[PDB]
Structure 1
């Protein structure tokens, strides 16, 4: 699709069989989702936002659908105020910024 930016670029994602709303974010290096259960082992990570850094759980090779596009990759889980699809998965689904 071509998504303009007059409103937030929110899409539906599916992860763990569940539908969630998330933001397509070219300013995010990684994907971070609100607290949920994911399979496997996780690794520690810090990410930085407008107000400072938070600790998150890094899950690798997680199956996730983004606006109907299937992806498999790293998902961070933690106390983010909004679900964010970052560049690691935007790149995988072929997204570019155009002007």
Structure 2
């Protein structure tokens, strides 16, 4: 698809069997998902943005279906107010910015 930016670029994702809405975010290095459980070992990480830093749990080798495309990579889970799909997974679905 070609997604216009008049509105937030929101897509349906599927992660750990759960359907969620997430923002396609070229400004985010890594994918960050609102608090949930994910299988596997995790390690703590700090990520910073507007308003400062939050501590998240970093899970590797996580599969997410993004708008019907399967991608695999690191998924951070923490007290983010929005689900964001970051560049680490955007690349895997072949997403680009065009102007």
**TM-score in terms of structure 2 length:** 0.98
Aligned equivalents of 2:89 and 2:72: distance in 1? 8
Q: Distance in 1 between matches of 2:27 and 2:93?
A: 16
What RMSD in Å do the two structures reach over aligned CA positions? 0.5
Cα deviation, 1:8-59, whole Å, max 9, x if unaligned, reads: 0000000011100000000000000001110000011111111101000000
Give the number of aligned pairs: 99
Unaligned runs of 5+ in 1: none
Secondary structure (helix, strand or coil) at the match of 2:65 reads strand
Per the normalisation by structure 1, the TM-score is: 0.98
Hey, what's the Cα distance between the residues in 2 that align with 1:10 and 1:49? 20
CA distance in 1, matches of 2:33, 2:58: 10
Structure 1 runs (4+) deviating above 2 angstroms are none
Residue 36 of structure 1: aligned partner: 36
SS of corresponding position for 2:91: helix
